Each structure stands twice: as structure tokens, then as C-alpha cells.
Amino acid sequence: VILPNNDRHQITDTTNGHYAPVTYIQVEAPTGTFIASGVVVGKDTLLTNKHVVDATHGDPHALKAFPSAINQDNYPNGGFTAEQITKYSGEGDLAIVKFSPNEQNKHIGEVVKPATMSNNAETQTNQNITVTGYPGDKPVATMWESKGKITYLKGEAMQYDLSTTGGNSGSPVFNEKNEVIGIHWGGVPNEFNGAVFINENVRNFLKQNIEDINFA
Ligand SMILES: [K+]
């Protein structure tokens, strides 16, 4: 949701630095295309939300991912088709998506460097963070970095005061060190946006399920 802090910048050099694994997701269901975001976290693996993968209606092939998409049909790393989805077992709106190599035989986390996950030991309320992904109020498949502060950390949940819009589902939340601290899921109008906070349990889930995920 859009919040009083609406500080968003378009990333056009989407493959530079930490932005490269930020990924644009289209779930191409016959009923329509669900747009979302995600972050590549391993050679074959990206994180996004449960509600994003639910949009596949059980067909993981419906989920297409375009790391570092710059804009509409402008996908410097091509696209990848999901093959296996593992939802987080906890409440958090988090899902792991693994991709097959694409039709160019490349891997989603070889065409871009997977994100580095934070161990979140130093993450705290009031820290400046960004949530970077693919808001649906911007033009198709454009990446935007939205800036704000953590406002709430509780368990496996975080909230923040920065703005996002549908399309951002699954966007990585980055700290200042450009580590992923959480995975945005959405928000509550006029109140906050929120992410799954990658605390010890969620890190454990991720490490159990993604062999090459990198925590700092
Ligand atoms: K391969």
C-alpha cells in the first residue's frame, strides 16, 4: 500500500549490484496474469510470497520469473519457468520457488548473483531499509526501490513505513548492507507495509530447503 512515506526510485541499471536478483514475476494463469516480485536466492531458487505461488493454481510452469527485468518485455536475463514450489510452513507469506534452467540452459541464479541473506542479528526498528521489486502502479516490469524505515519487528514479522503496491508481492527487503532481511508481502491501507522477517526459524526453513542459500 501507499503510505505517507512514498519514496520510490526506478532502477534502470537493474543488473548492477544488489538489484540483479530482484525479480519480476508473472504468473500466467489462464484466468489472468498475476504480477509479483521476488528475489533470487540460489542457483535455482527465488523467494516470493505464498499468495504469489497460489496464483499458479498448482501449475508451477505458470510462474515466470525475469530477474532484473528493466521494463515491459525488456528482460536482460531472460525468463525462467518455475518447476517446484515450497511454501513456508509457518504463517508467513513466504514461498520458495525453484526453476528449471531456461530455454537457453541458464540458471536463474547464474544469470544474476543470488542475494545475500542477512542473519538479521543487527536488524532493528528505525533502520533504513528498502523494498525493491515490481510495483504494479508503475509501468510493467519496472523495478523500483522503495525507501523507508522498519517500524515493527515481532517474531517472523516486520513492518515498515515505505510504500509498495500490488506487484511488489515477494519483493526483497534490503538493509543498508544490501542483504535481504525479509520478503515483502503487502500491507494494510493507511497503516503499514509488511514482510516476512527472516528470523532464525525462517532462516532455518530457508537453509533446509535451499542448499545454496547464502546467509552472511
Ligand atoms: K545446469
Swiss-Prot record:
Family (UniProt): Belongs to the peptidase S1B family.
Identify one Gene Ontology CC term for this UniProt entry.
extracellular region
Which keywords does the record carry? Answer: Hydrolase, Protease, Repeat, Secreted, Serine protease, Signal, Virulence, Zymogen
One GO MF term: serine-type endopeptidase activity
Q: Which cysteines are joined by disulfide bonds?
A: none
**What GO biological process, any one, is recorded here?**
proteolysis
Q: What is the protein name given in its UniProt record?
A: Glutamyl endopeptidase
Listed EC numbers: 3.4.21.19
The protein's job, in short, is: Preferentially cleaves peptide bonds on the carboxyl-terminal side of aspartate and glutamate. Along with other extracellular proteases it is involved in colonization and infection of human tissues. Required for proteolytic maturation of thiol protease SspB and inactivation of SspC, an inhibitor of SspB. It is the most important protease for degradation of fibronectin-binding protein (FnBP) and surface protein A, which are involved in adherence to host cells. May also protect bacteria against host defense mechanism by cleaving the immunoglobulin classes IgG, IgA and IgM.
Complete-protein stretch covered: 69 to 284 of 342
Question: What does the record give as the reaction this protein catalyses?
Answer: Preferential cleavage: Glu-|-Xaa, Asp-|-Xaa
Where's the active site on this chain?
H51, D93, S169
Q: Where in the cell is it found?
A: Secreted
Q: What gene name is given for the protein in this entry?
A: sspA
Query: What are the top taxonomic ranks of the organism?
Result: Bacteria, Bacillati, Bacillota, Bacilli, Bacillales
- What's the top EC group for this one? hydrolase
The misc remark on file is: The cascade of activation of extracellular proteases proceeds from the metalloprotease aureolysin (aur), through SspA to SspB.
Q: How is it modified after translation?
A: Proteolytically cleaved by aureolysin (aur). This cleavage leads to the activation of SspA.
